[PDB]
Amino acid sequence: DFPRSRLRFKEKLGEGQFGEVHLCEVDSPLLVAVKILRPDATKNARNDFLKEVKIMSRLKDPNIIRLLGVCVQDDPLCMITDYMENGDLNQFLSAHQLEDKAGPTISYPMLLHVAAQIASGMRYLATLNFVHRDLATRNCLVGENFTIKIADFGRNLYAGDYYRVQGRAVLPIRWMAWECILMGKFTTASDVWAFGVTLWEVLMLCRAQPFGQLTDEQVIENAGEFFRDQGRQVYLSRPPACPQGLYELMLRCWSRESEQRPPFSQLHRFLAEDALNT
Numbered sequence: 001d002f003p004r005s006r007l008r009f010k011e012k013l014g015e016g017q018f019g020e021v022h023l024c025e026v027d028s029p030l031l032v033a034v035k036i037l038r039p040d041a042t043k044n045a046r047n048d049f050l051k052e053v054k055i056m057s058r059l060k061d062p063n064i065i066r067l068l069g070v071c072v073q074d075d076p077l078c079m080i081t082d083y084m085e086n087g088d089l090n091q092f093l094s095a096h097q098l099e100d101k102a103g104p105t106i107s108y109p110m111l112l113h114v115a116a117q118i119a120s121g122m123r124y125l126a127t128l129n130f131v132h133r134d135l136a137t138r139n140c141l142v143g144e145n146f147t148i149k150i151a152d153f154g155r156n157l158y159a160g161d162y163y164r165v166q167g168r169a170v171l172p173i174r175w176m177a178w179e180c181i182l183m184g185k186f187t188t189a190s191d192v193w194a195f196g197v198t199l200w201e202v203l204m205l206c207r208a209q210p211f212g213q214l215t216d217e218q219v220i221e222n223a224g225e226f227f228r229d230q231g232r233q234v235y236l237s238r239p240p241a242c243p244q245g246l247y248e249l250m251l252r253c254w255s256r257e258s259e260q261r262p263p264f265s266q267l268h269r270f271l272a273e274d275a276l277n278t
C-alpha cells in the first residue's frame with residue numbers, strides 16, 4: 001500500500017467521470033501516472049473509484065494497463081499506473097505519416113506491431129471473459145518503443161465518437177457491432193468487431209472517424225441492415241496503407257454472425273506473422 005508522501009504532482013493529463021489523471025515524480029527520476037478523485041467528487045464517484053481498483057487489480061498483461069499501486073487505506077484515494085509518455089494512440093498516430101519507400105513517420109510493419117499488441121492484449125482479456133466494451137485507438141496508451149497498453153476506459157476531444165441520448169448509456173456506436181446497437185448484446189465477439197474498427201483506425205493512421213460522413217442515425221440504420229441481411233449494409237473502406245489481405249481480415253471481424261468472426265489468437269497470429277507476406 002503506497003505512501004502518497006512520495007508523490008510529486010507535475011502535470012494534469014486528463015479528466016474522467018469520477019477521476020483526473022496527473023503526472024507524478026516518485027522520489028524513490030521515476031515518472032508514474034496517478035489518477036485521483038475529481039474536485040467535485042460525490043460519494044457516488046468514490047464508489048466507482050474503489051470499484052475501478054477492484055476491476056483493475058485483475059489486469060496483468062504486457063499490453064493492458066497495469067495497476068502498480070494504490071493509496072486506498074486513507075484519503076486522498078489514488079491509483080498508480082505506468083506513465084505512458086506518448087499519450088493515447090489516436091493522438092499519437094495522427095501526428096505521423098506512412099513511411100515513403102522513395103513530419104514524423106511510421107512504417108507499415110510498425111502499424112502491424114501496434115495492431116498485434118492490441119490483439120495480444122484483447123486475447124488476454126478474452127481468457128478472463130472480460131468484455132472491454134469501448135475498444136478504440138483513443139483508449140489505447142502509447143509508451144516508449146511503440147509499446148501499447150489498452151486502457152480500462154476513457155474526455156471531450158473524442159465527444160463525437162459517442163452517441164448520447166438522455167437517460168441512456170453513452171454509446172460508441174461507430175465501433176459497435178450490429179447486435180450491440182440493436183440488442184445491447186456485448187460479448188467478446190463484439191469486442192472482436194470493435195477491434196476490426198480499431199485496426200481500421202490504425203491503418204487510416206486515425207485520419208478519419210469511422211463512417212465519418214454518415215450521421216449517427218445512419219450508422220444505427222446500417223446496423224439494422226446487417227440484421228435484415230439483404231446485402232444493403234455498408235462497411236469501412238480499405239485504407240491506403242492497407243493491403244487487400246489485411247482488409248479481408250478486417251471484414252471477417254464484421255461478419256454478421258458472431259461465430260464467424262475470428263478469435264483474437266488468430267487475429268494476433270495474422271498480424272504478427274502472415275501480414276508480413278508478399
Ligand SMILES: Cc1nc(Nc2ncc(C(=O)Nc3c(C)cccc3Cl)s2)cc(N2CCN(CCO)CC2)n1
Binds near residue numbers: 079081082084087
Ligand atoms: C492523457 C495523456 N496521458 C499520457 N500518459 C498516461 N499514462 C497512464 C495514464 C493513465 O490514465 N493511467 C491510469 C491510471 C493512473 C488510473 C486508472 C486507469 C489508467 Cl489508464 S495516462 C500522456 C499524455 N501525453 C500528452 C502529450 N504529451 C506531449 C506530446 O504532445 C505527452 C504525454 N496524455
